[PDB]
Each structure stands twice: as structure tokens, then as C-alpha cells.
């Protein structure tokens, strides 16, 4: 997995950047991949998050408290916030 | 100019559609139209600085995807001018 920029809970971010392999191997489509990744992240970290995975989409909106990163994995990216 | 999904108030949805049409007619890139939408849609929504927490979402691009339990009846994700654009309240 890779990244573009980061201002986040780097412990939770770098934990998720290697925990998302479970959903990537688990699911089989970008919608289902993002679903199975975010469900695992919500069960693990906390009951408040927001992730948009995939590519070919842009975003410039205000972030949450302590999470903001564009962390990718082989040009199938993730936009992560709390 | 076309919409694909919206759970929201009809007048608020039409206002967002008009603002999005104006922005898409004006702005160019993904970040540029994302920023114009995110800024200009915060006017006609009265921002309540009370205990409720809400925000704007910006997705103006070719093809990504998501499926979440967002804010109840507060999310409009359209697909217009060969650019899907999702905007939802922060849960």
C-alpha cells in the first residue's frame, strides 16, 4: 500500500494500510472492497470514520478531527478521514 | 445534467442541482469543481453550530464507488456532464 499525503492518526492509518489486504483478498469489486474494508475498520478502530476507496474521483472538503490522508495501494487508492 | 440518487428535501435537492449545474458550467477540474461545490452549497444550508455535527462531501470524477449508512435523508449523489458527483452529510 502507498500514500499521497497524510495528517491522521498514523497508528490507525498504518494499521489499516496493511489490514485492508484482508478485504482486498476477501472482496472482489471496488464497491464491495471498500465496504469490506470500512466495516473492518469500523469494528476495529471506532464507530466514527469515513473512507472512499478506488480511483478516478476527486475531493476537496473539510476533514474530521484527527484523520486525513490519501493512502493508496497499487493505484487503487483510499481517501481516509475520521 | 442528470441525477442518479438523492435522499433529501426536494427544494434542497433542486437548489443543489442548480448550484452544481452552475459550478460544473463554471469550474474545470475535479478539485476545482469539488471546492466550488463544497463552498457554495454551505450558504443555502443553515449551518447549525449546535451539538449536531455535519459536513459536505465532494466526489467529482469518472468512476469510484461507495456504499455507506450515511445521514438519514441527507445525501445526494448524482452523475452529470460525464462526471459523477457525490455529496453527503458527515455521519
Swiss-Prot record, chain A:
<keyword id="KW-0969">Cilium</keyword>
<dbReference type="GO" id="GO:0005930">
    <property type="term" value="C:axoneme"/>
</dbReference>
<keyword id="KW-0282">Flagellum</keyword>
<keyword id="KW-0966">Cell projection</keyword>
<keyword id="KW-0206">Cytoskeleton</keyword>
<dbReference type="GO" id="GO:0031514">
    <property type="term" value="C:motile cilium"/>
</dbReference>
<dbReference type="Pfam" id="PF01221">
    <property type="entry name" value="Dynein_light"/>
</dbReference>
<dbReference type="GO" id="GO:0097014">
    <property type="term" value="C:ciliary plasm"/>
</dbReference>
<dbReference type="GO" id="GO:0044458">
    <property type="term" value="P:motile cilium assembly"/>
</dbReference>
<dbReference type="GO" id="GO:0030286">
    <property type="term" value="C:dynein complex"/>
</dbReference>
<dbReference type="InterPro" id="IPR019763">
    <property type="entry name" value="Dynein_light_1/2_CS"/>
</dbReference>
<dbReference type="GO" id="GO:0007017">
    <property type="term" value="P:microtubule-based process"/>
</dbReference>
<dbReference type="GO" id="GO:0005874">
    <property type="term" value="C:microtubule"/>
</dbReference>
<keyword id="KW-0963">Cytoplasm</keyword>
<dbReference type="InterPro" id="IPR001372">
    <property type="entry name" value="Dynein_light_chain_typ-1/2"/>
</dbReference>
<keyword id="KW-0505">Motor protein</keyword>
<keyword id="KW-0493">Microtubule</keyword>
<comment type="similarity">
    <text>Belongs to the dynein light chain family.</text>
</comment>
<comment type="subunit">
    <text>Consists of at least 3 heavy chains (alpha, beta and gamma), 2 intermediate chains and 8 light chains.</text>
</comment>
<keyword id="KW-0243">Dynein</keyword>
<dbReference type="InterPro" id="IPR037177">
    <property type="entry name" value="DLC_sf"/>
</dbReference>
<protein>
    <recommendedName>
        <fullName>Dynein 8 kDa light chain, flagellar outer arm</fullName>
    </recommendedName>
</protein>
Curated annotation (Swiss-Prot), chain B:
<keyword id="KW-0966">Cell projection</keyword>
<dbReference type="GO" id="GO:0005874">
    <property type="term" value="C:microtubule"/>
</dbReference>
<keyword id="KW-0963">Cytoplasm</keyword>
<keyword id="KW-0206">Cytoskeleton</keyword>
<dbReference type="GO" id="GO:0031514">
    <property type="term" value="C:motile cilium"/>
</dbReference>
<comment type="subunit">
    <text>Consists of at least 3 heavy chains (alpha, beta and gamma), 2 intermediate chains and 8 light chains.</text>
</comment>
<keyword id="KW-0282">Flagellum</keyword>
<keyword id="KW-0493">Microtubule</keyword>
<keyword id="KW-0505">Motor protein</keyword>
<dbReference type="GO" id="GO:0005737">
    <property type="term" value="C:cytoplasm"/>
</dbReference>
<comment type="similarity">
    <text>Belongs to the dynein light chain family.</text>
</comment>
<protein>
    <recommendedName>
        <fullName>Dynein 11 kDa light chain, flagellar outer arm</fullName>
    </recommendedName>
</protein>
<keyword id="KW-0243">Dynein</keyword>
<keyword id="KW-0969">Cilium</keyword>
<dbReference type="GO" id="GO:0007017">
    <property type="term" value="P:microtubule-based process"/>
</dbReference>
<dbReference type="GO" id="GO:0030286">
    <property type="term" value="C:dynein complex"/>
</dbReference>
